Write a protein that binds this ligand. Structure first.
Ligand code: HEM
Ligand SMILES: CCCCCCCC/C=C\CCCCCCCC(=O)OC[C@H](O)CO
Ligand SMILES: CCCCCCCC/C=C\CCCCCCCC(=O)OC[C@H](O)CO
Ligand SMILES: [Cu+2]
Length: 309
């Protein structure tokens, strides 16, 4: 392919690896405790540090793989930030903002996680961790995207597209609102309001399906917030399908967003129905990661378009 130094494809490999590790750090948190002394332990059995005799269980692998990914992340992120900064910035000026964003948020989530060991009873603060971890991942994801695009003459995704004002409203607006919905979700978790409402879409058989207790209000607020996001994405997708059919990145970008929002909602309903089976929990952290990634991709398009035009 390219007669340049073979070490370059190693920067692409590092990008893929780190993006993957950062995704693991994020969605893996759906399987282990993030607060208290049992932090790092499978959520279903907070005791994994100390007393137990047995070893090599499938739940022990999860706990080892998460702590491993979290430790190795500092090494990987710093290396990717530096190397890509040194090599990719000449072509993409955005490279530096991303490298920096990657480092800052990796540290922010590590800082918040450290504090969660002892201040995990503050749900309002604890509910900030996911969104931070999410941006840590999205920063590395987009940086990796630029690393690949830097090595192509006909770029696949990072193309200078014409983004109209309305589409820009939807893109940026949905990006920001999705982050808010992400907070309400994290707030349900850390506030233990996950199973307050056995039914869907409404709360329960009693009180006409309306919340009448703390945990039911948190649960319901999350679902309500999610519904609005869902509807907005449908409106945004329809505008893309109608007015951006000639700009396939935007056309398909939103279709995939539509699909991720659907899978997010479905896995959310399944968390409830299954009474928080971690497999659905894991799915619920993963699809929002995909959707947010696409929204951050869109933000890069706008950032570049606003610089160009
Ligand atoms: C479609 C838009 C939705 C988005 C973007 C979204 C996002 C999130 C996020 C970011 C969390 C935090 C996860 C964590 O901290 O581990 C969460 C948790 C949760 N979500 Fe959603 N959610 C959506 C829809 C739903 C729906 C429709 C339901 C259910 C009817 C739902 C039920 C839950 C529950 C029960 C939790 C807490 C799970 C736990 O304790 O780990 N979500 N959501
Ligand atoms: C609401 C929360 C929103 C979270 C979005 C944050 C990071 C996404 C990753 C970066 C997306 C692309 C940004 C590109 C950019 O800003 O480039 C600037 C400029 O060229 C100078 O280097
Ligand atoms: C696993 C994580 C993989 C994430 C890789 C993101 C970069 C990418 O896939 O870029 C593709 C494009 O076609 C480039 O020209
Ligand atoms: Cu309670």
């Amino acid at each position: 392919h390219m007669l340049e130094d073979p070490m370059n494809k190693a920067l692409k490999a590092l990008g893929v690896l780190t993006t993957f590790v950062m995704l693991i750090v994020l969605i893996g948190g759906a399987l282990v405790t993030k607060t208290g002394s049992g932090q790092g332990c499978g959520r279903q059995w907070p005791l994994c540090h100390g007393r137990f005799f047995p070893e090599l269980n499938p739940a022990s692998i999860i706990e080892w793989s998460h702590r491993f990914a979290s430790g190795i992340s500092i090494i990987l992120v710093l290396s990717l930030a530096f190397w890509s900064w040194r090599k990719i910035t000449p072509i993409f000026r955005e490279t530096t903002f991303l490298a920096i964003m990657s480092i800052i948020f990796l540290f922010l989530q590590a800082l918040l996680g450290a504090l969660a060991v002892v201040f995990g009873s503050n749900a309002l603060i604890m509910a900030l961790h996911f969104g931070i971890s999410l941006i840590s991942f999205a920063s590395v994801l987009i940086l990796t995207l630029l690393i690949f695009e830097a090595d192509k003459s006909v770029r696949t995704l990072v193309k200078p597209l014409q983004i109209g004002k309305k589409m820009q409203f939807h893109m940026i607006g949905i990006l920001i609102y999705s982050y808010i919905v992400v907070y309400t979700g994290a707030y349900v978790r850390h506030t233990e309001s996950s199973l307050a409402c056995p039914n869907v879409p409404l709360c329960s058989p009693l009180n006409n399906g309306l919340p009448t207790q703390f945990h039911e209000w948190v649960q319901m607020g999350h679902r309500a917030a999610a519904l609005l996001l869902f509807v907005w994405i449908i409106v945004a997708a329809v505008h893309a399908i109608t007015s951006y059919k000639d700009q396939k990145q935007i056309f398909w970008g939103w279709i995939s967003c539509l699909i991720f929002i659907t899978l997010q909602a479905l896995s959310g309903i399944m968390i409830v129905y299954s009474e928080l089976a971690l497999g659905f929990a894991l799915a619920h952290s993963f699809f929002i990661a995909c959707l947010f990634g696409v929204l951050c991709y869109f933000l890069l398009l706008i950032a570049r378009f606003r610089y160009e035009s």
